[PDB]
Amino acid sequence: RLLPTNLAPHAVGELYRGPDQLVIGQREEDLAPVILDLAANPLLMVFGDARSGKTTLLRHIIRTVREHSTADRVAFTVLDRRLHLVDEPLFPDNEYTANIDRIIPAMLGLANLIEARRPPAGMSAAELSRWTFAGHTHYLIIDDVDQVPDSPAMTGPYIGQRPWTPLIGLLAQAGDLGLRVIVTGRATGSAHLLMTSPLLRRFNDLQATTLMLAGNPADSGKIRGERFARLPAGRAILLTDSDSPTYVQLINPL
Ligand SMILES: Nc1ncnc2c1ncn2[C@@H]1O[C@H](COP(=O)(O)OP(=O)(O)OP(=O)(O)O)[C@@H](O)[C@H]1O
Ligand SMILES: [Mg+2]
Structure with a gap:
């Protein structure tokens, strides 16, 4: 079927189908709505070369989550060095930073928050009793993650420390601890990053949902054979757990 080239946010029916269920576009087969289930798969990585739509998809997610949530149930943390998401409102007190030097402590403190939700040792088949957690589902949004140096810090209070370290051990249980993580990066270089970045290698080892926007059919490499x-x-090409790769058109907000 013929996908559109500019998909309006009202052409797809209800954008919010329940917590963590977000319509993000239409698929090529039948133009049916493409529904991101962030409760089932809390991790999403989006790869695309210049001006292909990475940040716009992040804006669409933030806006759709925010329009149908309350500030005491949902919180955002947005890391955005290029500042193209300053526009988009969050909830009150939510961390938006473009400062490469605030990233290390911001992630340490987010990690301490999610880590405190884990169940005690000594349980064994008594936790699958709605253990959950008390508070916010926390959406961590990292635009242009491939442009944050992931090497140990050379200057400042956090010398020798790396930005993503406290996050890694959280990713496997993000869906049980109220954490979602959405990141974007260029298409060129992405396959190598999937192998060398501790962060993106863990996303891929956990089969994160992937959106492949425009890229180079030669140089940009293969992601899961594509x-x-x-x-x-x-x-975009949409890679999920359950279906084979699917062509989709993402909603263009505003
Ligand atoms: N879903 C969409 N539908 C139609 N057009 C889009 C869509 N997303 C992005 N665009 C077009 O591309 C432009 C750039 O989009 P955006 O800033 O999201 O790209 P990007 O991949 O984040 O760019 P950069 O590589 O600079 O970070 C938009 O201004 C719009 O013209
Ligand atoms: Mg961008």
């Missing part, structure tokens, strides 16, 4: 294609803005 090459990038030269696509218009917002057109």
